[PDB]
Amino acid sequence: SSFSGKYQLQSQENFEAFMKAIGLPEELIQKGKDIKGVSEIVQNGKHFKFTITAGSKVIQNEFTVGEECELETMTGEKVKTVVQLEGDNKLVTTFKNIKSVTELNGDIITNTMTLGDIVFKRISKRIGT
Numbered sequence: 001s002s003f004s005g006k007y008q009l010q011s012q013e014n015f016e017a018f019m020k021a022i023g024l025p026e027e028l029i030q031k032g033k034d035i036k037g038v039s040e041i042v043q044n045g046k047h048f049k050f051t052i053t054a055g056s057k058v059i060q061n062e063f064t065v066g067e068e069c070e071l072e073t074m075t076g077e078k079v080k081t082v083v084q085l086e087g088d089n090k091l092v093t094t095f096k097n098i099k100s101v102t103e104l105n106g107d108i109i110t111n112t113m114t115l116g117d118i119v120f121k122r123i124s125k126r127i128g129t
């Protein structure tokens with residue numbers, strides 16, 4: 001259960017540019033750019049559940065490492081992909097030509113999403129249990 005916990009965004013880079021590019025409606029971009037969203041992760045072996053909350057908007061997802069899964073993404077689009085572990089503390093997946101890497105270092109999770117030259121980076125910190 002390496003990843004299990006509750007974490008809140010501390011800061012992020014290129015939210016607006018990234019979200020516009022992938023189809024987030026601009027009213028959502030404007031309300032969302034300064035939201036410090038909360039990620040809740042339950043890991044049980046290869047099985048993951050996570051909830052992302054960003055004011056009024058709650059996305060729940062689940063996947064088993066190494067297997068096909070269906071992920072609901074930022075716009076609501078559901079994509080079929082595979083999430084892999086690269087060691088105990090790093091989740092890697094690709095969907096819609098976006099490469100997503102989620103890495104845990106103690107209490108800090110860094111999420112990097114790359115779409116072409118745009119690198120959307122989010123840094124979050126554990127908040128309690």
Ligand SMILES: CCCCCCCCCCCCCCCC(=O)O
Binds near residue numbers: 029053056
């Ligand atoms: C009422 C305010 C509207 C909020 C809508 C804007 C939220 C868009 C952001 C989606 C949640 C963040 C997804 C990040 C996923 C991750 O990095 O792995």
Ligand SMILES: CCCCCCCCCCCCCCCC(=O)O
Binds near residue numbers: 052
């Ligand atoms: C909801 C957007 C799709 C998510 C694509 C990555 C999913 C595989 C790994 C899940 C990591 C969840 C990210 C929590 C860290 C954070 O909020 O920045």
